[PDB]
């Protein structure tokens, strides 16, 4: 018993707490910080608080559905099954209320959770305690036992007191918002998907309560001869037929499809219909808003590529380039980026050295390992040099190197067919894994032959400036290269 | 009296005026600039203009609600209570009209508020004076006293003249837009929240006026036998039942739920219904628009993080990296950024030197103060050197330093467990607050031991290039470091 | 006559053509390029084409409103007023059709407008000529005169032929889209405002045509006993009562408020109601879409400032800074940027040298002209040096300079109160227009006194590195500075 | 036969596969990788799989429209035409099911498609096989032949079994999403246009099925006296009148226009109406969402230009520039960018050397070829130097060069009129194709004359720093320039 009884009320070492406090030593400091603070204090991130709030979510989603129906469509709440259900729930929500004095609290300051018991009690008794209190105690039964020391008046007034329980929706909202921030910090939740499912739960709950209110107001007026229950001649129907019609009216007002069987006739039905129409029209506008925010997040990568490309069309149309030249540019962007939008330089700068090294070795080691230098050189040298290679793409017919031009760069074939075209011989084809232009290294001069693309070529290259920038840090390899 | 009487009509030194004009000397220049301009001129930003416009907002939101009801649902406006309410309001709106000749005006030029009395009078008499004038004077009572020197015709025409007061909505719009720009400049208002509450006020006001117009047109036609008031048999009901039904019709047309008890029969009811449907359908489309603009601002930080990350998935899927390597990258981004999106370099560049110094000393002074150099060095030196430290994160199993590699950097542990793993001894653990790699400073060579992460490590580091860039400005500290 | 008759058919020198072709010599080349091309060819950007299309817009918005009403709600189109209106309009739309062989055309290639008469005729006769042709000729009257060489059948079929005129909506769309691109290139139109007014015109036009179709189908069936016109007992009403009810039905289906007096009974009324509901529900969804795109453009500057600031909250909450330090940062951003978002460096880089010079002289010449160097120096020197000054802001209590620190910068007060606080004397206040720290210029050493902000200070500064970078280009001024 | 029979089941060399695998040698490796894997295995990207899925799309869009109608509005499915249609379709969907064991599969890992036959069979039998199986076999006819070894009960239950075919919508969704990703990789599809047409197909299909369900529930209850079919007295109407009314009800609930002839009376009609209202209200909210995402993509270039410009208004209003200076800046942006937004530096950096060379030679070779140096120099020199030219724009009255200032740059006229204004002579005009300021090259000094813009000038320029940076790579041209 005791070894778990103290262990449950303080932060366990887990994927949330290690990512939140930063290390097991920071978690174990926070465990010590509550274990010194007082008797039975509960940390906000504790497993006890998780499983307790999980019981509250089940308990509240039960109560906020059952209570409106029990008050509205049944004769009395004084029978044994209703006395049992209400005393069970009220004692549970009163245990939750006293635990909100022993539990700590978080803040936007991101500082360590406030865990002094007097600091918790003084903050709670100001912030939320009054709405938690009047909805925890059985205000209707404690009024009734006082009224026991006409009957058609006291029962009605009692039904109005019984609905003070619906303020438990504040706890449902609070406890949902607390655990969704904890799931964001652990399970990579999409914000728009979380947000729309919160609104869907509220729309169903408001539509259910409205579907009670539309019958409750006639009942509190003793079913006047001009209201919808009397006009539809269903005052004596079953509780399920009445609930189905009252929910159908509420949902019809919420979606603006119609009023029910006819438009309102009495003052009560006019003003309850208009309240329902406004709560509906606002929920549906907020739902169309959330559906739009969701849909605009889903294809964000496609969208950003379309916006990026359209600025190339603005550039080409400002410069008034001819349509065949625009087709080369359009075709180049499709081969180089393949509809994927990213920034290679920005992404590699925020990685660490081990991840940059691992991604570069995966991309380029199979291409470089065929070369006679890199087959013999040190691993701590080639892994440094591969980080300097720049990716390039060439279209068919383009010259990659021209004879007689100064050779500032040398290249490696990743994909496609190239052709060396010196006048001294028949043309030699080059293919994936081969390399060319190497005679630019550690020398100077014009290129001895031209090279051109016979198909879409995907290449890697490095400049003699970047090659020298590497070799300046590896003078032993510089001496080995200078020999041949 | 006199010391306040001149003080109220010119800009006070306060959080708005000091932020607007830039200093107390610029405010006191503007006070002098109105005190020299003429008798009783009012500066736009004055406390007198604030409290006067605040009285106008209360006066207008009263009048624009009461006047449509008084004209539409009551027999005559010639009785003592209506003569009192209209003469009180009309004299107040006429004082407001003459004060709009003495008050200055702002411009999009952002230049000093136009405060010459002839320049104010010539600008106002062109821009808005005519709509302000015909809605300030009691056009109905001055028509009636002339008509007094058939009765069923003159009363009707009088009801149409009494609604020229509704042009006071132009002043309500103008004065709201002026004070909301001043609150934006003082209380950090969210623009979408301000914008949606402006539209909500207009939707309620238009829905109220429409709910009058739907009854007013039948009344001006003497309740013809084919209109909704006659068909519903409520020409003799109370003013409250008639208003409740007419508002219910208007609101039903505005939300497109239905027509009321039946579809229109007469020409008057057809064309008023269609006008109402169009004003409704446009307000509801504008409201769904504002709700969408609001919702898309609320999770902007989450959204931007999701969009930033999805470009890493585009990068990884273009390079066709294997799924286990993608899991290392996904796990690295969660530990390094924790779902927070920001640019450290961009944010620190727009701060001033005191704030950069204060943020850097808060982050790093507790880590650096354990070091033997920085425990002895000058405070104006260490505060400069801390600005060069770069934050890094390492996953478990990654090598932070390799034995025999060139040591270009040295590090400090902020969080996590590292292990030094030289072959000369058993492995030594390192933890938060410790430091390693220091032998790279003021020397050259390969690293004497390897160091690796046993858990997620959060580190700070500085390169020997940045260390030298600091020490070049502090040659006295350079001599102290060169000794040991 | 002749001097205008050739001048109207070719591009005039105006704000559009000079901005489109780039100069008066490029416009005069384009005038020559049409004057050589053939007899009476019309350039797309000509004044004749503008005023002709303006006549077509008035002619089409008349015809597309009048023709549906004339066919639907009147007994016959063979009477003199309808023969006159149709022959006047058909001959005008046939002149427009032959002018579309003589007018040139633009392209997405942005190349010079296609102006060869055979190249225009071959392109038009493929692209749009068939829809333009069958809607220009009077197909109904040429069918009727052939049918003249039972009456209840031929009149009905004639009403169906008369609606081939509604294909003139293709010309209305084409000519609107051409002139809106020309107004974008001249009058700084907001795209969302233009787009929403195009949709509003289409919604009104579709709603008007639907309101004809709902009556036309019953009329072509000879008013069957189960359709809405028969059930409402209005087959013998006036044309205006019938049109008002049929428009009310159409608009009710378009906005989804209801069906009219009752739901459909016949097959004709079911399928026309469902067609109307679908065209409505799609127009209203497209309108809520355009209203959202409009609203999200209007506060784009506020929005971007809120998004920029929230990344500072992500930075502060990642670094876990304390709430008082966050209040200094929040207060600093409000004083430095005042809710305005911009990039000073990006905006100044895309201006030209004259505009950079003019903006810098407006901001800084009044501050620099009090200085003893800049009161005596050359104007071509000080105008260069002012471009190096960097703007800074300091909060109250912050030290701008510390005694004994190395002075890398010197400053100028634009606004606020500073205080010099050397131990050798009582404190001296400094105010807007004064300057300090000047002893750092052309020397080296520690600062002789500290300086601190007593109120929010707005300052300009330049580093000794930037001062030297200027003076290296002005050695004559360097010699003058070296003397004192 | 055989030469095509093996060729159809493996990736052909085409615009998709060459862009996906990267080259013809990578495609031919993938062909070999399936040809070695087993008997008759099908690659996901094969032509056989394309034409088979195209037959499935036609087969499914037929079946999912016909089957609900056949079950709902006809007496029995045991007659010869229905036995033929169901056995033809069920055997086709069973061939599709066995082919899903022989076809490979793709993954988010982007690795080569999983093509081992045991790895395909074990993955499919877990993922989707059960929903594919119960919808391929004729579950209703195999139940009926067992029940053949009361009639009003067995037929009803049979109609419920016949709708297990509607699970073929999962295959329709899967096969559409597979081929749309392949069309994105080949035909430059806009994502929002693709997405909205997927939703439009689902809205029509759900509305059709709902329009069956609204009649099916009454039919399964044997048309009770309180349901809509009985109240409208149409139990004996034709199948087309019943379908038209049931579709009209469903579509009315989907769009929230009304219930049909009257609101529900029975429990069955209440709960089916509310199900329809919810499925409708959610589809319409998702459609308004997609229409908004579409509309916001269409004018993305206009939008981004408006947002870019409004930051210039924030800059000007922060600096409080006067209105005439703002008009120069506003006018400059319109002449320099012409409403086109792009980044010249970012776009040219992601192109290759051949495209940069081709775009630069198109823009600038006609301007440079008039110059006496560039008419004589090497083509490999001038093509390098043209890449250094920076575009500039000047407003009328602005000085481009001032006499006596240091000449760091020289210019070329692309468009507009300039004037040289030395005091030694009458003013000389300069026009498109001319050049000035050339005496700054290979020397030093103050400018011998001023030059100013008489009209909007569009210019190119290069600095002496960039000219020297070019000539340092071409010492042979440096010697030729040094001679004159
Ligand atoms: C009472 C008298 C009223 C008449 C006065 C009004 C006349 C003024 C007419 C102006 C015509 C302007 C048309 C400009 C067209 C621009 C392009 C456009 O109008 O594009 C949006 C329409 O496109 C859509 O969405 C339409 C959606 C249809 C959906 C088909 C079913 C699925
Ligand atoms: C008159 C005859 C008409 C029949 C002709 C039309 C046949 C053409 C069928 C095409 C099928 C295409 C389906 C493609 C599916 C793509 C994904 C998708 O369709 O995703 C959006 C639907 O998802 C949703 O929103 C649905 C929302 C349901 C909400 C559940 C309750 C909460």
UniProtKB/Swiss-Prot annotation, chains A, B, C, D:
Annotated phenotype, changing residue 79 to P: In GEFSP10; uncertain significance
Outcome following mutation: residue 159 to E: In DEE24; uncertain significance
Protein name as it appears in the record: Potassium/sodium hyperpolarization-activated cyclic nucleotide-gated channel 1
Disease as annotated in the protein's UniProt record: Developmental and epileptic encephalopathy 24: A disease characterized by early-onset seizures, intellectual disability of varying degrees, and behavioral disturbances or autistic features in most individuals.
Source species taxonomy: Eukaryota, Metazoa, Chordata, Craniata, Vertebrata
GO biological processes: apical protein localization; cellular response to cAMP; cellular response to interferon-beta; general adaptation syndrome, behavioral process; maternal behavior; negative regulation of action potential; negative regulation of synaptic transmission, glutamatergic; neuronal action potential
Substrates-to-products reaction catalysed: Na(+)(in) = Na(+)(out); K(+)(in) = K(+)(out)
Portion of the full sequence shown: 94 to 586 of 890
One Gene Ontology cellular component: glutamatergic synapse
Transmembrane segments: 50-71, 81-101, 123-143, 159-179, 194-216, 270-290
Quaternary structure annotation from Swiss-Prot or TrEMBL: Homotetramer. Heterotetramer with HCN2. The potassium channel is composed of a homo- or heterotetrameric complex of pore-forming subunits. Interacts with KCNE2. Interacts with the SH3 domain of CSK.
Glycosylation sites: 236
Recorded consequence of changing residue 297 to P: In DEE24; results in absence of hyperpolarization-activated currents; reduced amount of protein at the cell membrane
Intramembrane segment ranges: 243-264
Main location: membrane
Keywords: cAMP, cAMP-binding, Cell membrane, Disease variant, Epilepsy, Glycoprotein, Ion channel, Ion transport, Ligand-gated ion channel, Membrane, Nucleotide-binding, Potassium, Potassium channel, Potassium transport, Sodium, Sodium channel, Sodium transport, Transmembrane, Transmembrane helix, Transport, Voltage-gated channel
Organism of origin: Homo sapiens
Membrane topology (Extracellular): 72-80, 144-158, 217-242, 265-269
